[PDB]
Amino acid sequence: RTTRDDLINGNSASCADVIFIYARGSTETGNLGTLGPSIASNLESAFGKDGVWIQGVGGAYRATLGDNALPRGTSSAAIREMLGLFQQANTKCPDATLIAGGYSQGAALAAASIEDLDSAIRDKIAGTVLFGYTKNLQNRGRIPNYPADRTKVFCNTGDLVCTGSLIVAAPHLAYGPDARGPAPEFLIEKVRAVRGS
Numbered sequence: 001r002t003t004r005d006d007l008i009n010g011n012s013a014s015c016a017d018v019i020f021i022y023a024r025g026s027t028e029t030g031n032l033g034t035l036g037p038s039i040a041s042n043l044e045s046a047f048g049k050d051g052v053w054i055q056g057v058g059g060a061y062r063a064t065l066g067d068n069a070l071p072r073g074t075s076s077a078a079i080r081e082m083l084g085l086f087q088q089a090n091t092k093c094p095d096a097t098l099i100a101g102g103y104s105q106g107a108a109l110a111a112a113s114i115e116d117l118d119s120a121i122r123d124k125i126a127g128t129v130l131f132g133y134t135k136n137l138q139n140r141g142r143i144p145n146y147p148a149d150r151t152k153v154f155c156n157t158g159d160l161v162c163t164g165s166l167i168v169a170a171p172h173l174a175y176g177p178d179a180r181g182p183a184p185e186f187l188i189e190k191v192r193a194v195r196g197s
């Protein structure tokens with residue numbers, strides 16, 4: 001449900017073909033929060049339960065609201081945690097195609113992590129989805145050092161965090177439909193683009 005640790009719990013002798021690493025929003029529960037489970041269910045439908053590993057960013061990532069104000073939009077500890085998961089994926093399952101996502105603070109975390117990542121690992125992330133991207137204006141809708149064609153940003157009209165503010169208005173909490181349809185649709189398309197079908 002809201003907690004998935006498929007990568008950490010997974011057997012390297014039986015690696016999934018696709019590994020999804022997701023960071024939740026501020027104050028959300030488990031390691032997937034409100035949007036992660038919806039995306040996970042659709043990925044499982046497309047690749048099969050054993051074909052995809054769902055991994056939320058837990059550990060040191062406390063999803064503390066105040067951390068949105070820090071330089072990178074999240075804490076250094078959180079960035080270290082997500083980088084560690086990408087590194088664990090690369091080591092445990094070198095042939096797996098990676099995909100990533102994040103919501104709100106988790107989107108800033110995903111962007112910061114991907115920016116700092118070793119290029120050889122970053123290049124294995126076939127697609128990344130960001131909801132209510134807090135650094136949308138600052139980064140011009142991009143993730144530094146990562147291609148635009150592999151990036152999809154969902155920023156609602158009226159969601160102030162997408163326009164350079166840290167105010168939480170109603171549109172910031174309305175990404176449900178995107179997580180149920182277009183976000184997994186994009187991730188599936190990007191994985192099939194490189195893996196075939």
Ligand SMILES: *[P@@](=O)(CCCCCC)OCC
Nearest residue numbers: 025026027068104105166
């Ligand atoms: P997001 O981190 C919230 C918006 C960040 C700006 C507020 C200071 O997660 C929503 C639960």
